[PDB]
């Protein structure tokens, strides 16, 4: 599936996934195609995504899986020609959890680089029966090139109130897509080869994410140090066999400070890691920079 | 506190969704608008930020047939989904016209979810006009009782009182537009204190303090222009037919006065002094101001009375 404009499709499925996609649209995530797949028969969350599919008209993960399988031909036509496909059921469970692995499985058989994004709920939300959430991860993992896992519990170490906890979760979920897609789609001083992104993420397994932000003097080293040490990475970093790092910032981000952060991440990473590094121009940020680190794979000693 | 409060306004059922459309058309700022209904077509014409169609198999997109139990089940069936839309709100408004199936039965579900999450939860609903018939009146009564259980504060506006206000409504359509406007005035009279304060700043913490667990409430509205406007608008508000002449009895009162950026303390204080004198001798009264540079020489007073 060769392209020089990388075709990136972002699929939100189920109520939480469509809601995640609506937030990306509302925040102006650029360069990707949004697809909203509703999986529930009794309700429909509307969306401004350019492409929409209501497979429900026909809160169990099993119900979502069969609804998605029932619509496999339509989903495939929707995904055909993508170089990369993100799939997420977003926050909360339900039918989207059963549908996401089917979308992933189809994207991968098509040859797209297939990236799942899945959240672990906060421990205080309790647990609905049969271990559903943890079976959704395992199903998603069997059919993704890379599954990015966001353990929401680790956000309470980044003092957090309940509303702040929920909002922090929504924002890091949006970053699990945007951090990577911006690096591919929006030019910075340091640009990356999509084939290198593919070499890092194809068949790579589960990955964790870290984020950091800083302003003013020494901002790049500071934000990179926060990101590399993020509790959301759960110390995945020293074993990771593949590391992707993106620095978003204004047009005036200097080569020297860019290179300082690049050097820090190479020191932090396993000696044998592939490291993909680049920058993103976002003039809306003033003097803030924002760093995303994706750490994929594991040390096998 | 420098805290940025997140406010979500839910309209559920046809009347609630039309009220939310009116809030959007009048430029109410600082809040996210959510529309919930049992009719995919009506929702298509909503301008809300989030639109959720519920009860699709039970109603097949034609509303609850005036049956509140149908509306309750459609909302409850979509509880996890509604909760994920509300997650993160500091304050939630639930607005509807009581008396039909979708709003009557579904509003208490929305409010219970928001309350369980700990958001300050404010209902703003109408009673149907008496000419709509006794079944709608009874259904609304029951829906209001259920909603009151789920809200921190529930503001109830009787549509019958609207007919004693303003000019004689030409037509059913204009009367319901008047209902839309008063539901907007009830939401905006509170949220603009938080989102666009004037000289006397009443913030989210202050509003939570007086509206948490306050119970059933009434509203009055008044506006005037030119010389003596603040005293005039405040007197209209506290005599409002909507307040059912209950200002004297209220032990909790929130008042907001909106005016241009040149609304000054003398004027503000003249209106507050008027309202203090008409209030219960033990009333807790919070006075706040709103900047609204679109108003001209006009000021708008809103009074929320609770604690009877
Ligand atoms: N504010 C406002 N209220 C309305 C409007 N139309 C009707 N109402 C009031 O709202 C009440 C409930 O009507 P409506 O909201 O349309 O029903 P519903 O909740 O959607 O219930 P349904 O599914 O059985 S049709 C009516 O009895 C009437 O008093 C409107 O356009 N704006």
């Amino acid at each position: 599936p060769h392209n020089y404009l990388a075709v990136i499709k972002v699929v939100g499925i189920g109520g939480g996934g469509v809601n995640a996609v609506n937030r990306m649209i509302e925040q102006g995530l650029k360069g990707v195609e949004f697809i909203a797949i509703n999986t529930d028969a009794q309700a429909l969350l509307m969306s401004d995504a350019d492409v929409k599919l209501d497979v429900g008209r026909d809160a169990d993960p099993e119900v979502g899986r069969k609804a998605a399988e029932d619509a496999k031909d339509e989903i495939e036509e929707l995904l055909r020609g993508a170089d990369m496909v993100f799939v997420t059921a977003g926050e909360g469970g339900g039918t989207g959890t059963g549908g996401a692995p089917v979308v992933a499985s189809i994207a991968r058989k098509l040859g797209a680089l297939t990236v799942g994004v899945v959240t672990r709920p906060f421990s205080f939300e309790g647990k609905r029966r049969s271990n559903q959430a943890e079976n959704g991860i395992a199903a998603l993992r069997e059919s993704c090139d890379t599954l990015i896992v966001i353990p929401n519990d680790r956000l309470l170490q980044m003092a957090v109130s309940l509303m702040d906890a929920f909002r922090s979760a929504d924002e890091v979920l949006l970053n699990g897509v945007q951090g990577i897609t911006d690096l591919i789609t929006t030019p910075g001083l340091i640009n990356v080869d999509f084939a290198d992104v593919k070499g890092i993420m194809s068949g790579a397994g589960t990955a964790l994410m870290g984020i950091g932000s800083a302003r003013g003097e020494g901002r790049s080293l500071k934000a990179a140090e926060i990101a590399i040490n993020s509790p959301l990475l759960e110390a995945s970093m020293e074993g990771a066999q593949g590391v992707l790092m993106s620095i978003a910032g204004g047009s005036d981000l200097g080569l020297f400070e860019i290179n300082e952060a690049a050097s820090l991440v190479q020191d932090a990473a396993h000696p044998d890691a592939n490291i993909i590094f680049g920058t993103v121009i976002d003039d809306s940020l003033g003097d803030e920079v924002r760093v995303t680190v994706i750490a994929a794979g594991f040390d096998v000693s």
Side-chain angles (χ1 to χ4, degrees), chain A residues 1 3-4 6-29 31-56 59-71 73-108 110-127 131-141 143-221 223-301:
Chain A
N3 275 91
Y4 291 95
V7 178
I8 300 174
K9 290 173 194 268
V10 171
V11 184
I13 187 155
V18 169
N19 189 221
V21 155
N22 290 347
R23 298 189 79 274
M24 295 167 196
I25 298 170
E26 155 71 26
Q27 305 227 350
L29 186 53
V32 301
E33 180 178 80
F34 297 111
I35 309 173
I37 304 182
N38 197 81
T39 40
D40 306 302
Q42 284 280 29
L44 164 82
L45 177 64
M46 290 180 56
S47 166
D48 280 328
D50 36 80
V51 182
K52 301 166 251 220
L53 188 71
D54 185 0
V55 305
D60 224 310
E62 193 62 16
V63 159
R65 186 192 68 80
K66 315 214 197 121
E69 301 281 9
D70 280 355
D73 296 326
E74 301 174 76
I75 298 174
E76 183 178 359
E77 272 318 306
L78 290 190
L79 296 180
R80 189 176 302 279
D83 296 288
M84 185 182 197
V85 176
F86 287 74
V87 191
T88 188
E91 314 288 342
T95 53
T97 289
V102 184
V103 176
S105 207
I106 287 159
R108 193 134 157 62
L110 279 169
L113 175 69
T114 305
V115 176
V117 188
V118 62
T119 66
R120 302 182 177 291
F122 297 96
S123 281
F124 64 72
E125 298 175 68
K127 211 173 187 206
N131 217 3
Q132 290 158 41
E134 188 63 33
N135 320 111
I137 290 162
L140 201 44
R141 167 189 292 131
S143 40
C144 283
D145 279 300
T146 290
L147 183 56
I148 299 162
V149 186
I150 305 174
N152 279 351
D153 274 352
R154 308 282 82 77
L155 303 165
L156 301 189
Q157 307 154 215
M158 292 166 227
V160 173
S161 95
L162 187 62
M163 290 70 178
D164 286 314
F166 288 137
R167 295 192 292 255
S168 168
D170 285 342
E171 298 154 28
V172 311
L173 169 59
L174 183 134
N175 208 95
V177 171
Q178 171 164 28
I180 296 157
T181 65
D182 277 359
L183 181 68
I184 299 171
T185 70
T186 311
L189 176 69
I190 307 301
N191 297 301
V192 307
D193 207 281
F194 166 82
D196 289 347
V197 181
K198 209 181 159 53
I200 273 297
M201 309 211 221
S202 320
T206 63
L208 299 181
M209 176 180 43
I211 62 156
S213 168
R215 317 194 70 101
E217 176 82 1
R219 55 187 174 172
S220 285
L221 267 184
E225 180 112 344
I226 293 165
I228 280 159
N229 292 288
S230 173
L232 273 179
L233 281 168
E234 299 195 325
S236 61
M237 185 78 203
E238 70 183 298
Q241 283 311 280
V243 177
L244 180 158
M245 175 177 160
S246 175
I247 314 186
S251 279
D252 72 315
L253 203 59
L255 189 46
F256 181 89
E257 79 181 295
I258 287 165
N259 201 49
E260 282 183 314
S263 184
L264 178 79
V265 75
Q266 277 197 39
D267 297 337
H270 193 279
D272 297 325
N274 282 292
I275 305 184
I276 296 310
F277 175 86
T279 63
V280 171
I281 278 167
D282 176 9
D283 281 321
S284 92
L285 292 169
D287 72 327
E288 191 191 20
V289 302
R290 318 178 171 200
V291 178
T292 311
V293 161
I294 306 299
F298 65 99
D299 183 14
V300 85
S301 286

